[PDB]
Amino acid sequence: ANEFTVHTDLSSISSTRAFLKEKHKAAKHIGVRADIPFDANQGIRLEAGFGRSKKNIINLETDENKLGKTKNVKLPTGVPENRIDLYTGYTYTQTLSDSLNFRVGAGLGFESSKDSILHSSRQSWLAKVHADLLSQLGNGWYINPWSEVKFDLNSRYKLNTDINQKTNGWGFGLGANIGKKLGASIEAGPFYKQRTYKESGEFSVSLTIPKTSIREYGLRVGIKF
């Protein structure tokens, strides 16, 4: 059977780059997923999602700062950011037991993010592999632990200075949804995601784009038709 999920996330996102931290507020995301079987085991997965937050850029703490003896210059607050994600891939699913199903897939994806202070953009074409276990608990209840890993094939950092440099990286996500059939199913659960973009090669003033690391903790809630 075809399965379609619409979901929404509430999350805490933080990022570190060079000597700075970026903390997000009002981080929200909406997305959809379609798992479409073609035979007993093979299928296709399609995903699309849209996210938004506002971020404050802050310095890393030092004892000199805590002591008085220096003072941090003011940095931007309430910086808006928008994100989109898309994914299409092959899936293979099989039964491990009468109450346990195991699904694995791989495919191609796109991610982008844009902020405004000055616009910075990150656009990434990537490959993604994912695996998840669906375990029946009885009475229509289930648990669904999942994992996914992303690898950039062509990730570009853009800056309306203009700058457009390649910054390939990778990322991984892990979570687990607890769900219940309503006759449709409702599910909810925690997730963790991490994304790293490497420092770019030297480009011409000689510069690099600093290494960026993003970490995200959240709760996802979904309706599975």
Q: How many other β-carbons are positioned within 10 Å of the β-carbon of residue 35? A: 19
Question: What is the bridge-based pairing of β-strands 3-17 and 212-224?
Answer: antiparallel
Angle at 111 between CA 155 and CA 219, to 5 degrees: 135
Question: For residues 225 and 221, what is the distance between their CA atoms, to the nearest angstrom?
Answer: 13
Binding mask 75-94 for ligand CCCCCCCC (x = CB under 6 A): --------------------
* Residue closer to ligand CCCCCCCC, measured from CB, 38 or 192: 192
Question: For residues 26 and 22, what is the distance between their CA atoms, to the nearest angstrom?
Answer: 13
* Residue closer to ligand CCCCCCCC, measured from CB, 12 or 82: 12
Task: Identify the three-state secondary structure at position 16.
Answer: strand
Residues near ligand CCCCCCCC (CB under 6 A), total: 8
CA 40 to chain centre: 30
Residue among 115, 212, 122, 119 nearest 165 (CA): 122
Binding mask 141-180 for ligand CCCCCCCC (x = CB under 6 A): ----x----------------------------xxx----
Q: Smallest distance, Å, CB 91 to ligand CCCCCCCC?
A: 20
* Residue closer to ligand CCCCCCCC, measured from CB, 84 or 143: 143
Among 92, 192, 203, 225, binds ligand CCCCCCCC (CB under 6 A): 192
* Residue closer to ligand CCCCCCCC, measured from CB, 37 or 190: 190
Q: Smallest distance, Å, CB 32 to ligand CCCCCCCC?
A: 21
* Residue closer to ligand CCCCCCCC, measured from CB, 79 or 214: 214
178 in Cβ contact with 191 (< 8 Å): no
Interaction between residue 217 and ligand CCCCCCCC (CB under 6 A): yes
Task: Identify the three-state secondary structure at position 12.
Answer: strand
Question: For residues 148 and 105, what is the distance between their CA atoms, to the nearest angstrom?
Answer: 9
Q: Smallest distance, Å, CB 115 to ligand CCCCCCCC?
A: 25
Find the largest Cα–Cα distance for the chain. 68
| Structural tokens at position 182 | 């309503």
Residues at the interface with ligand CCCCCCCC (CB under 6 A): 145, 174-176, 190-192, 217
